[PDB]
Structure formats: C-alpha cells, structure tokens
Amino acid sequence: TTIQVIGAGLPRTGTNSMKKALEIIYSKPCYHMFEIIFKKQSDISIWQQLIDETHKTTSDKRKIYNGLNELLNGYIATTDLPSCSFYKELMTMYPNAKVLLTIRDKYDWLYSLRKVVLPKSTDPWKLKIEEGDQVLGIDSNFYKMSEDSLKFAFQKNHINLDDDEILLECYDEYNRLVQEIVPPERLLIHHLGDGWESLCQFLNVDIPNGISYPCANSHHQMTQLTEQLIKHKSLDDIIHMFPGLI
Numbered sequence: 001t002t003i004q005v006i007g008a009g010l011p012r013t014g015t016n017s018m019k020k021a022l023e024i025i026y027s028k029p030c031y032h033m034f035e036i037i038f039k040k041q042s043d044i045s046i047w048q049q050l051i052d053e054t055h056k057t058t059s060d061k062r063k064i065y066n067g068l069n070e071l072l073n074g075y076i077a078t079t080d081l082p083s084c085s086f087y088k089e090l091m092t093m094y095p096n097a098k099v100l101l102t103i104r105d106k107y108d109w110l111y112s113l114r115k116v117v118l119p120k121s122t123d124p125w126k127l128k129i130e131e132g133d134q135v136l137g138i139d140s141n142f143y144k145m146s147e148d149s150l151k152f153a154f155q156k157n158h159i160n161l162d163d164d165e166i167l168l169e170c171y172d173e174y175n176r177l178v179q180e181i182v183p184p185e186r187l188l189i190h191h192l193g194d195g196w197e198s199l200c201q202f203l204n205v206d207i208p209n210g211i212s213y214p215c216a217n218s219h220h221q222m223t224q225l226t227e228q229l230i231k232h233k234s235l236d237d238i239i240h241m242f243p244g245l246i
C-alpha cells in the first residue's frame with residue numbers, strides 16, 4: 001500500500017471527516033493527527049526532526065523523503081497537520097497521488113482553530129486543553145510539533161500566533177498557493193458540506209451506497225471531550241460518549 005491521496009487542507013477544515021471518507025472508499029488506513037495522538041505518539045519526535053530539517057540553510061530533502069516514507073508506510077492517504085504542511089514533498093515522492101484541499105469560510109476556520117488547536121497564549125481555555133490532554137499523555141512535545149508544522153505551512157520564521165489578522169491572511173495565502181502549485185487535474189478543492197459526489201468523481205469511484213459522509217470532530221465535540229477528560233481523568237472511562245471520533 002502506498003500514498004494515493006495527499007490531504008493539503010489545514011487543521012479544522014474537515015480533515016478527520018476526510019480521513020474517514022477515504023478509509024471508507026479505499027478500505028485502507030489514512031493518516032491523521034489523531035493517528036499520532038491516540039495510537040502512535042512516538043511519531044511526534046519523528047515529525048519534529050523533519051520540521052526542524054526544513055529550517056536548516058541547506059535542508060536534507062532525502063532525509064525528509066525517507067522519514068515521510070517511514071511514517072506513512074501502510075497508509076493509503078494522509079490529512080491534517082503535520083502532514084498537510086509537507087504536501088509539496090509528498091507530491092514529489094508520489095507523482096501519481098492526487099491532492100485534496102479541504103477548505104471552508106476563513107472566519108469559521110479561525111474560530112475553530114482557536115477553540116481546539118491554537119488558542120491565544122492568554123486564553124484561559126488553553127490551560128484547560130493542556131490539562132485535559134495530559135490525561136492522554138499529550139504535552140509540550142505535541143504542541144511544539146503542532147505549532148511548528150503550522151509555521152512551516154505558512155512559511156514564517158517569526159510570526160505572532162496570537163494575531164487573528166495574521167492567521168486569517170496566512171490561511172488565504174496558504175490555500176491560494178496550493179491551487180497555484182498543484183496542477184488542476186491533480187487537485188480537488190472540497191468545501192465543507194460537499195459530501196461524497198465530487199470526491200468520488202475525482203477518485204473515479206461510485207458513491208458509497210447506504211453510507212453517509214462523515215461529520216466528525218466539531219469544536220463543540222472537542223470542548224466536551226476536554227471537559228470529560230478533566231472530570232474523569234481517563235479516556236476509556238469516557239470514550240463511549242464520543243462515537244465515531246477516533
């Protein structure tokens with residue numbers, strides 16, 4: 001099994017739903033941030049090494065190609081951070097892989113990002129996220145890798161992550177750049193709510209009969225999850241409250 005589909009869309013653009021969508025179409029695993037968090041946290045350090053490699057004056061691109069290949073082995077596809085930030089490299093490694101850009105209203109995206117992935121440094125909620133994630137064994141290593149992958153995406157060394165205006169403009173710039181770099185035939189722009197049709201057409205498959213297009217990982221669902229991890233201090237004790245999430 002090798003990479004058939006590259007997810008270039010940013011966090012909070014429906015990437016988990018897209019992961020579950022492709023897992024239905026291909027009947028093979030798709031990589032995602034949640035793969036790291038819930039199954040393979042050992043991958044965090046690997047991604048960090050690759051991200052840090054990009055910041056060198058002369059980056060070892062074969063080091064990155066090889067590391068990407070080891071991480072994504074046995075996966076048919078990948079979405080969300082940190083793999084989205086490497087969509088250029090992935091396209092090179094897998095010249096036949098198609099590219100998906102999941103996208104949405106820029107204002108709804110920033111709000112989602114703030115609530116789940118990248119709170120302002122002075123937001124009390126940020127402390128709650130960290131507290132809840134500690135139950136999962138997630139700490140500063142994940143947050144740094146996560147933030148670093150996002151800055152690599154936005155191609156910024158020094159950037160003020162607490163400035164909403166910068167984030168909003170980076171978002172537009174990132175999405176524009178994807179469309180510019182990826183040949184049209186090799187790219188599908190999938191807006192939230194688009195469902196099965198364009199995706200299945202683009203991958204030359206039938207629409208999966210009797211199965212609804214996944215709708216997972218809402219920020220309301222994420223807030224509840226953080227709150228329940230704090231309250232019960234155990235994932236397994238509470239997982240039955242979050243079907244279809246992992």
Ligand SMILES: Nc1ncnc2c1ncn2[C@@H]1O[C@H](COP(=O)(O)O)[C@@H](OP(=O)(O)O)[C@H]1O
Nearest residue numbers: 012013014015016017112193215216217218219
């Ligand atoms: N089928 C669908 N239709 C509409 N929105 C969807 C969707 N699937 C996922 N989403 C939204 O996409 C976001 C999750 O993105 P990701 O999986 O990359 O983290 C969430 O946004 P909100 O936080 O606004 O609820 C989630 O609600």
